[PDB]
Paper text:
Dinucleases of the DEDD superfamily, such as oligoribonuclease, Rexo2 and nanoRNase C, catalyze the essential final step of RNA degradation, the conversion of di- to mononucleotides. The active sites of these enzymes are optimized for substrates that are two nucleotides long, and do not discriminate between RNA and DNA. The active sites invariably consist of (i) a catalytic DEDDh/y-containing core for divalent cation coordination and catalysis, (ii) a leucine residue that wedges between the two bases of the substrates and (iii) a 5′-phosphate cap that coordinates the 5′ phosphate of the dinucleotides. Here, we identified a novel DEDD subfamily, members of which function as dedicated deoxydinucleases (diDNases) that specifically hydrolyze single-stranded DNA dinucleotides in a sequence-independent manner.
To understand the molecular basis for the specificity of dimeric NrnC homologs toward DNA substrates, we determined a set of crystal structures of diDNases: (i) a complex of diDNaseNoc with dpGG to 1.55 Å and (ii) [name] from Rhodococcus (diDNaseRho) in its apo state (1.72 Å resolution) and in complex with dpGG (2 Å resolution). Notably, the structure of the apo-form of diDNaseRho resulted from crystals set up in the presence of the RNA substrate pGG. However, no electron density was observed for pGG, confirming the low affinity of the protein for RNA substrates. The biologically relevant assembly in all crystal structures was determined to be a dimer using the ePISA server, which was consistent with the oligomeric state of the proteins in solution. A comparison of structures of apo- and dpGG-bound diDNaseRho revealed no major conformational changes in the protein upon substrate binding (RMSD value of 0.45 Å for 1604 main-chain atoms of a [name] dimer). However, two minor differences were observed. First, region 142KTPRLS147 appeared disordered in the apo structure of diDNaseRho, but became visible and folded into a small helix when the substrate was present, owing to the direct interactions of the region with dpGG. Second, three side chains coordinating the substrate, H88, H89, and Y213, adopt different rotamer conformations and turn toward the substrate in diDNaseRho-dpGG.
Residue numbers in the entry:
A (entry chain A), B (entry chain A): 10 to 141, 147 to 213
The structure:
Amino acid sequence: TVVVRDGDLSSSFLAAARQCGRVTIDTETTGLSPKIDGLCTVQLHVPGVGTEIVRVDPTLQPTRLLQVLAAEEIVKGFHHAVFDLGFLRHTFQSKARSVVCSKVAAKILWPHDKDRQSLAGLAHLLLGVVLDSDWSQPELTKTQVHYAAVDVEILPPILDELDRLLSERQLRELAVACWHHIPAHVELLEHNLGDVFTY
Amino acid sequence: TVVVRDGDLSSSFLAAARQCGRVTIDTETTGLSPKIDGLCTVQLHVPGVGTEIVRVDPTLQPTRLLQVLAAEEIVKGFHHAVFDLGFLRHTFQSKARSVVCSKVAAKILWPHDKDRQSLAGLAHLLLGVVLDSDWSQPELTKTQVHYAAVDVEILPPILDELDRLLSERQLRELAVACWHHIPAHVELLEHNLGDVFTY
């Protein structure tokens, strides 16, 4: 159900992503600064199919992964899209389209509850699920591999639930607009442009 | 060339805006807080035609003005769109489409020069033009009327010039994306939702 891939998403998962129309994605990194630290792996999950851990190769562009990220017809769900896309933007010059983010959604629904805005907070509140280091190792251990996959496999039902809550509060159109802005926000951070919406 | 209108944009200026496809807009207010202070007037300029000062009437929705603001086919140019649209959003529940802003553009081009991001800074730098109180008075004076119109009439060439500069630096697509976000940002401020793009 989980396969570690070197350099790129597999052709089989590219086709599966295209058939699904929806995937979930996150990353493992050497630190918390998208423009400085290293991108080690990208996790991609296709609901009903499984998960790939893509090990980044500095000498190889992950062509099929970048196609998925750029595809308007495939929705990419994240639990911290600005963070992950910042790494993908800085590392591969990747400009994504059709991204959604559970953190953005949770910030619209519960702006004052930081703990609810994390994926562990959301999985606990909504699903009753309690979510439990050297990602550049020559070999990923079974413990590393199982952990690396947990977040992308729990994200689809969380996103489905947040969509319903947003819709019931008449805030889904605002979330859709905010999700649409994420790639431009990532671009603003890449260029050190700051908050262009103040006065 | 300038006409003070009570309650709403005139039918003649609605037609002229539709023919032009582009207008410039700003406001006069009782203070600097869009969700607290009063919206006194809305200025609208149609290039080549003239300017209307719309005096806001609390008992009258400015129907034609709101149609212009909502029209996808009419670009509305501002020199501080988030500020002005915040007033229009709070006062009339107006949700604009196809807005552009010289301040957003200047913040992308010159992020570190606050003086260049104001309309007076832009008019001076680009055009060599040097831009020179009770907006709720029973009557607007000729001095008030001429001042209220200056900013919207100088904005069209400034926006044209900023577009060229953005395009030459390959930053126009980013500005277009940021301008597209302005109404959603205004919505976020209306709901006290803050920065939904942090982590």
